Design a protein around this ligand. Structure first.
Ligand code: A1D5F
Lengths: 498, 494, 493, 495
C-alpha cells in the first residue's frame, strides 16, 4: 500500500514514500555537508543534484559518543553515524495544501540524539493534527559546539554555536522549501526537549533566527539550560583540544583529526554538561534569558513545561543520588547553586521522603529544569506574549518507582509514539496512558494551529500569567494548578540564587 | 410451537415460535471461510433456492477444551467446524422495528459460541420487547492469527479476522433485522470479557462506524487483549512452529488440518496470546486512544466489572486461597510487572483473612477494572452518556471462594439462571432471581431508552469525572460514587 | 608517632610507628617505567645512598575514573603517574620474621591502586602479627596492551607487563621483607576479582613459582579477563587507531602521554578489553589448563565468591533490575552464547523478582562461580590442599538489591569498616563487626598457619569432589555441602 | 535509728550510717574532682584526707541536662549538680565479711543520670543477697565524651572516653579498697542499663577494665548503643565547639566555660545522642562487638536481656508511635536504618495488631535494643563464654497500657526498689509486680555471687546458645521461650 511521492526542492528533486495517508521523506539535506573546509564552519545551502535523490532511508547522525540512555532502558540502537550528517526528515498529510508545520530539535545534552530517533517519528503527529512534522540534525559535541575563537582567532567566530547555526539553516530550508512538501512557512512551530529545549531558548534569542517561527515549545529545558560564557567555553575547548592533541593555532592538526577522536576527546572530560550554547557575542550576542527578558520573543507564543521528577533520570547515571551520605549530596548541590547550597539543603531536607538525596532531587529538578521554565514563563507574561505552562505527572512504575515522572518520559505523549520502538518498557503499559498521551498530543497540535493548546480531551486551560501562574498538569486526571512552585519560587528568591 | 418463515436478502429462512417469542437459529451471515477463503476477510453467504432451515444452531468455531467453568458446570463441548459464521435471532414477531441487542460472547478470544444456552435471547426478547441476536466470530489462529510477516501484505487484516466477522454480522443485522422485526437504526452491541474486549475495538473500528449506536461492556474493555502488530507478529511464529507450517508456504498453510491450529495456539500456554491487533487497517490505532479522542462520543456506554473478577481463575490455579507470600508475589509480577512489590504492600494491609484473598482485588483491578474506569472517564471528558456498574452478587458454590467471579453475571443479564448448569455456577439461592431482573430491566432500559434507570433501581446518575457514580448490583442495589478513589491514586503514584 | 628507618637492598626508607604498628609507604620496587622504560619489563630501582621518605604513598597507575565505586567512596581524583611501581609494608616491627601477606587489588586491569583505603594492612598486622604488602602495578594499556605484532620483537610479553610488575614486586618482597619483620619464605598471595584473576595466573605462571607458598582467591580465577593472543591483538589494533599512533611509530609510542592511553581504552567501549594474555611465554598455556595438569600442585588455596556478585554491575545497566528480555538476552548471550536459552529457562523457574534479577545469578555463575569451582577442583584433583568459601553478608544499600555484592567482603577482610564511607558501602548494622572478624581472623590464620580454621568457626572441611564442602559466611557461619549442586548439573549440558 | 559506722579508705576515713543490717556511705570520692585544670583530663586518684569524712549525704551529680521523659511521669526534682561530681555510694551488710560486689553504671545516654537515684538503691540487694552494691557518678555530656584529640591536639587524647575513664577509676578504687567495706574484690559483677549497659559493653573492649569485674549484666543496651567513631565524635565535637564558642586549641576557653554552658551547647545540637563513647584508638582499640568477636571477653560470663516494648517509652515524647501518620513514622525509621527502611516496615506491618505506629515501635526496639543484645549474646556463646538471655514482659498499665514493657521498666524490678520515690507511678500498683520483682531481684543476686542467675523462684533457666537460643521470660508466670525473635533475626539478615 506504500507508494512513491516525488517532490522538488530548490536544490533538487527527492523521492519519498507515502501510503496514501502520510508521506515521509528521510535524509533530506538542508545544508552543504560540513566537512573539510566547512568543518567548524556555519552551514551553507545544499549543493544541487541532478536526478531524483533517494529519501527512503534515514541520513547518518552526527558523530557522537555512545549514550547508555539509549542502550540501557530503551532497546534503542547505537545510532548509525557520519560527519556528513546535515539531513532532515519530513512527515506531512499531503504535498497539496498549506498545513501548520512542527519543527523538532532533539535533546541529549548537546552530545547525543537525532531527528531520526524512532520515538520522534512524525506519522502520528501528521495524521492527528493536519500538520507537517520535520526533524533535523544539528552538529553535536566538539564538531558542533567547540568554541575556538580564543584558540584559533576570528576565522572560527561562532564555532561555539555551530549546532545552533545548523538549527537556523534547517529553519531557513523550511521557509524556503517546505511548500513543496505541503507546508505553510508563516505557521511554523519549533519544539524541542532537553538540549533541544535549550536550543529553542537559544533560537529565541538569536537575531539570525528571527522571522523563521511564530511559535516555540521548550520541554524540560530553557534558555538558561547549558548556556555558557565565552571564557568558560574557551577553557573547555583547551581541555578538549589537549585530549585531541591539537595545539591552538594549528589548522593542519584540527582538520586532520578523525571525527571519532573528536567525540572521544569530549568524552574524556567526564559526566555532565561539558559543551553547551556559548554567549559568543555574534551568534549569541547575550545570554538567552537576558534576551528573553528584553522582549525578543514578545510576538512569539511559547508553551513550556517540566516533568514532576525532572532530575530523577540522572540517578540511573549517578547512583549517589540514592545514598543518604550528607557530605557528597552537598558537593553535588554546591556545583549547581554555589554558596547558597546551605540554605536550600535545609529547606528540601524537611520535605519529601526517603534518604536526604531522594528529598534533594526536587532541588536538582528546580535548579536545572523548573528554574529555567518558571523564568521562561514569567518573562513572557511581562512582555505580553501568550504562554501556557504544564507539568507532566504521569509516573513510570519501572525500576521500583524511584524514577516517577522523570526526565524524557513525556516525549511519547506529545508524539503519540507509545507503540514506537517498544516504548512501553520505559513508561509501563497502563491503559490510562493513551488518554494523557492524546491529551498532550492534541494540545500541542492545538497550540501549533491556533496559538491555544485547548482541546476537548483537556479541561479549560487558562493562559499562563504572572498573577495566578496557571499550570496544566498532565496526569491520569488532568487539572490546572495555580503557582505550584510558589514555595520554591519564594525560597529561591530569598536564598539569593533565584 | 408454530413455524415462522422469514426472508433475508440471501434467501428465506424457517424458524420456530411458541406464540410468545420466535427464535431463528444458525442463520448464516457470511460465506464459509474455507479453502481459498480461509484466513481471508468474510464474504457474503451464497444464495439458496428453497426455504433454509433456521431451527438448528450451526457448528461452533474449532476450539481447545478450556473446561474452566465447564468442569464445575454441567457444560459440555460444542460441535465445531470452520464453517461457523452464523447468527441467531429471537424476536416476538417478524413485524416491527424493535430495538436490537447484539451479543458478543466471551472466552478470551479462543472459546465460546452464540449457540451456548446462556446466551438464549428468549427472556431478553419477551421482557423488554426487543430483538436479540447472538453471533459467532472466528477464534484463535483462524480468527486472530497475525500472518502479515509470514505471507506479507496480501493477508492484511489477518490479526482482526474475528472482528471482521463481527462487522459482517453487524452489516447483516442492518440488512436483515427489519425482516425479523428489529430496527437497524436501534442496534446495541453488548459483550462480556473477550466479547466486551471486541466491543471496545468496535468503538474504534472505522468500518464498524454506523453499524451500531450503543455499547455495553461487561468485565472487559477495549484495553483487554489488544496487541501491536510487532507483538502480534512474534506470536504467529511460535504458533507456526507448533503447527509445523513454514512461513511463506501457502500450500502448507492450506494443507494443514484445522485442528492443528487449535493445538498450535494452545501449546503456547495460558494468557491472552491472541487478540485484536492495532494493524492500522481494521484497527488504525489502539482502542484506548480512540476513547480519549471522543471517537465514541456518539455511543452510549454501560461499562462494569464483577466485584471479585480474578477469583474465577483460581479454579485452574488454587494458590489464591492461600496465605503463602512467595507464590502470590510471583503471580502479581506476571500481570503488572515492576509495580508488583509495592502494589502487594498496599493491598496486604487492607481487608481481612488470607493474603491471597487480600491480593485478589489487586488482580481484579489490573485485568478488568482498569480498562472499565478508563472507558468511563474518556467518555465523561467528551460528555458521551456513560453508566458504570459493579456486580456484587456472589455464588455460594466452592465455599464462597469465587464470590462475584468473572463470568458470573452472564445469567443475571440474560435472565437464564434456570438454564442447565447455570445454578451449579451461581448456586441455587432464591434471592438470585430478583438480582437477575434488576440488572435485566436496567439492561432492557438502556437498549430501549438510552437510560438504564428503572423502578427496581435507585436513581442512577450518569458517570462523571467529579462524582463518578457507579451502580452496584446487589441484593440491595445502591449507587456508590468514586468507589475506586483510593485504589486509583496508588496505581498512578508511588 | 616516630620516624623509623629501614634498609632495603636498594636504599634506606623512612616509615612511622604509632607504638603498635609500623608502616612504610611509597617504597619503590622498580625503576619508573617512563620514557625508554615505557612498554618494557620492570627493572629494579637504581640504588640510592641516604634516606628517602617512605611516609608517603607512591603514585597510582594512570586509570579511568571508577565512578561506580568512587560515588560510594567519594574519594577525590587519585594522584596517578606512569611512575607508579610502589608497594607499602605494614609490620609490628622491622625486627622479626613473620609470615607475609601480599595483596593484589582488582579493578579489571585498568583501574585501582594499593593506596585505596579499604586495603589498609594495619588491622591484619596489628591483630595477626603479620607483614602486609599492598602494591601498585601498571594498569590499562601500559600494563596489558599486546604490541608484539604492532611494534615487533622488543615487546615480547607486552600483553603481561602488569603481571610482570606483580612478579617484580614479589621479588623485591623476597629479598627485602626480612628487614621489615617478614619471613621471606612464608608468603601468601591473596587478591580480589582482577587481583584474584592475577593470582590464578600466578599459580599457572612458571616464573612465579616459589615466590609464594599459599594463595587466597576472592571473587576471581585464572580465567578472569584473560585473552588469547589472537583476541589481544584484535583489541590492541583498536587502541592504536583510537590513540592515533601508527604501528611501527616507535617514538610516538614512547612519546604519547600516559593519559592518552587511558582515554583510548575508554573509547574501545565497556567491558574487560585488557587482561593477561596467553602469549606463550609469561603464560605458556591457559591457567585452568595448567592448574588441571598440576602446575600449581604445591600451592595451597582458599577460593571463594560473594553470594550476589553481579548485582553491583546492575547500577551501570538497569536492565538486570528491569524485565526487558531482548537487552538481557543480548547481555546474557554475549558471555554464554548458545547455552543461555536453557540457562535463562533454568534460572527463570528458580528464585524471585525480575527476569533480569532472576537472570543475574547466570552472569555471576558464568564470570565468577564457575572459575572458582574449576580452580578448586583442579587443586583437589591434583592433590593440592584447597578450601572453599561463599560470602553471604548483604549490603542494605539501594533497597537491598545489591545483597552480597561484588567486593563487599574487602572491608570485612581487611577490617577497614571504620574507614571513610565504608559504612556507606556496608551499612550501619552492628552485626558486620562480627562478620568482618570471621573474615579477618581466618585470612590471618591461613597466612600464618596455612589452615583457615579458627575457634570462632564451626568445622570447615577441605573442598573435595566427594562432599564439596564450602564454608558459608553469614551472621551465623555454617558449612553448606555442594551448595551449587543444582546449578552445576545444568551448566555442563 | 541511724548510727555511724566508720571504715578507712586508702585516701581516708568515712562516716556512714548503719541500720544494724545495712551500712551506706554516700559521696565517697574515687578520684580528685575533675574541675578547672583537671577538666577534660583523665580522673586522678583523690588526695588522701585525715579525719572522719562525712558520708551521710549523697554527692553532687555530673552537670547534665534536665530529664522530662520519665521525670515528668514520676515527678523527679532537679538534680544537684557540680563539675565536681566523682563520688560513689556503697551498700554492704557489714564491714565484716567477704561478699560478692555488684557495681552499677547508670544510663542517661552519656548526658544525664546519677548513681544516687533512688531506683538504683542497693539496700534490698545487700540485705537480701549479702552483696556489696556500688553506684557511681561519671562525667556527662561535653566534659565526659568530647573527642578533642584532633581539635585540641595530643594533650586531649582519650578525652572522648573520660566518662569511660571515670568508671575505670571507680573500678580500680573498688579493687583496692572494697575489702574495707566488707566485699571481695575478685567476685565483682558489673551491671548497667541503657547507656550504662553500653558502658559495660564498651569496658569489655577497653584493656584497662580487664580483671575489674568477673561477670557483667547488660540491660537494654549494648556496646553499639551510643558509641561513635573518631570522625563522627570529631563531627559532633566540631559542632559542639562552634556552639560553645571555644576555638580549637584555645585551652583558656575550654577551661573557663561554665559547666551549664557545656550542657547548653550540647542541647543546642538538637535531639538524639550527640555524645558517646569514642573509638579513639587508645582507651578503645576496637569496637566492643569486634572485641567480643575477637574473644577479648571469652572468659567473662555475661547475662543480657531486653524488655518487650522498649521503644514505647518514647511514645510519651512523640505521639506518632500511637498515630497512623505513615509519612512521619517512616522518616523517623528511615533516619535510623537508611536504605533498609522500606523492606523491614513491610515485614513489621505484616506482623502485629493495632495502629501503624504501634506496629513500627518494635522496629525501633529491635534496631536500637534487641539486635545489640543479640550481637553481644551471640558473640559470647561463640567464644565459649557462659551467657544467659532474658525477656521482661511485664507491662505497665499507666496511660491506658500503651507503654507496656517499656525501656527502663525493669530497673525498679532489678533492685526491688518499687516503693522508692516515683517508682510506683512508672510501674503501676498491681500486686503482681512484687512476685515478678522477687524473681528478678534475686536473679541478679545469684548471677553476681555464682555466675549463674538460676534460683528456685525461677524455673530451670537454660544457658543461651546459638543451638537453642533459650531466653527466660519474666512475667506473672515466667516461662522459657526458644528463639522468640526468630522471624526478626532471619528477616534482618536475609532478603
Ligand atoms: N560493563 C562491564 C561488564 C562486566 C564487567 C565484568 C567484571 C568487572 C569487574 C571485575 N573485577 C574487578 O575489577 O573488581 C572490582 C569491581 C570493579 C570496580 O572497579 C571482573 C569482571 C565489567 C564491566
Amino acid at each position: 500500500e506504500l507508494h512513491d511521492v516525488i517532490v522538488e526542492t530548490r536544490y533538487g528533486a527527492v523521492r519519498g514514500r507515502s501510503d496514501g495517508t502520510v508521506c515521509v521523506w528521510k535524509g533530506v539535506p538542508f545544508a552543504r555537508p560540513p566537512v573539510g573546509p566547512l568543518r567548524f564552519r556555519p552551514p551553507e545551502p545544499p549543493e544541487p543534484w541532478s536526478g531524483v535523490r533517494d529519501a527512503t532511508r534515514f541520513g547518518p547522525a552526527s558523530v557522537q559518543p555512545e549514550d547508555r540512555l539509549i542502550s540501557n532502558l530503551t532497546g534503542g540502537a547505537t545510532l548509525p553515524q557520519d560527519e556528513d550528517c546535515l539531513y532532515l526528515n519530513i512527515w506531512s498529510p499531503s504535498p497539496d495544501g498549506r498545513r501548520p508545520v512542527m519543527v523538532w530539535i532533539h535533546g541529549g545534552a548537546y552530545l547525543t540524539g537525532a531527528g531520526s530517533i524512532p520515538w520522534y517519528d512524525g506519522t502520528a503527529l501528521a495524521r492527528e493534527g493536519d500538520v507537517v512534522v520535520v526533524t533535523l540534525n544539528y552538529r553535536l559535541g566538539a564538531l558542533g559546539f567547540l568554541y575556538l575563537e580564543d584558540a584559533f582567532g576570528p576565522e572560527f567566530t561562532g564555532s561555539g554555536n555551530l549546532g545552533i547555526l545548523d538549527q537556523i539553516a534547517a529553519l531557513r530550508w523550511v521557509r524556503e522549501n517546505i511548500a513543496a512538501f505541503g507546508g505553510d512557512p508563516d505557521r511554523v512551530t519549533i519544539f524541542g526537549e532537553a538540549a533541544g529545549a535549550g536550543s529553542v531558548g537559544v533560537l529565541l534569542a538569536a537575531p539570525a533566527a528571527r522571522g523563521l517561527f511564530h511559535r516555540a515549545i521548550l520541554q524540560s529545558g530553557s534558555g538558561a539550560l547549558g548556556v555558557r560564557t565565552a571564557a568558560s567555553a574557551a577553557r573547555v575547548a583547551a581541555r578538549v583540544l589537549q585530549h585531541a592533541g591539537v595545539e591552538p593555532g594549528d589548522r593542519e592538526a584540527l582538520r586532520s583529526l578523525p571525527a571519532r577522536a573528536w567525540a572521544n576527546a569530549v568524552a574524556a572530560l567526564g559526566p555532565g554538561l561539558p559543551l553547551g550554547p556559548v554567549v559568543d557575542g555574534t551568534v549569541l550576542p547575550e545570554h538567552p534569558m537576558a534576551a528573553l527578558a528584553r522582549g525578543a520573543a514578545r510576538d512569539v507564543a511559547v508553551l513550556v513545561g517540566v516533568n514532576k521528577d525532572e532530575y530523577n533520570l540522572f540517578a540511573l547515571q549517578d547512583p549517589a543520588w540514592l545514598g543518604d551520605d550528607e557530605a557528597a549530596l552537598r558537593q553535588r548541590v554546591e556545583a549547581v547553586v554555589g554558596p547558597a547550597a546551605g540554605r536550600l539543603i535545609e529547606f528540601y531536607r524537611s520535605r519529601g521522603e526517603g534518604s536526604l538525596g531522594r528529598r534533594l532531587l526536587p532541588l536538582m529538578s528546580y535548579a536545572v529544569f523548573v528554574r529555567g521554565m518558571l523564568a521562561t514563563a514569567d518573562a513572557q507574561a511581562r512582555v505580553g506574549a501568550p504562554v501556557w505552562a504544564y507539568r507532566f505527572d504521569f509516573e513510570t512504575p519501572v525500576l521500583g518507582g524511584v524514577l516517577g515522572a522523570c526526565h524524557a518520559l513525556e516525549i511519547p505523549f506529545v508524539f503519540n509514539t507509545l507503540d514506537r520502538a517498544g516504548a512501553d518498557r520505559f513508561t509501563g503499559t497502563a491503559p490510562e496512558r493513551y488518554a494523557v498521551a492524546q491529551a498532550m498530543h492534541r494540545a500541542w497540535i492545538a497550540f501549533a494551529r491556533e496559538g491555544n493548546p485547548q482541546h476537548d480531551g483537556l479541561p479549560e486551560w487558562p493562559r499562563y500569567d504572572l498573577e495566578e501562574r496557571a499550570v496544566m498538569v498532565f496526569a491520569v486526571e488532568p487539572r490546572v494548578e495555580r503557582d505550584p512552585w510558589r514555595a520554591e519560587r519564594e525560597v529561591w528568591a530569598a536564598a539569593g540564587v533565584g
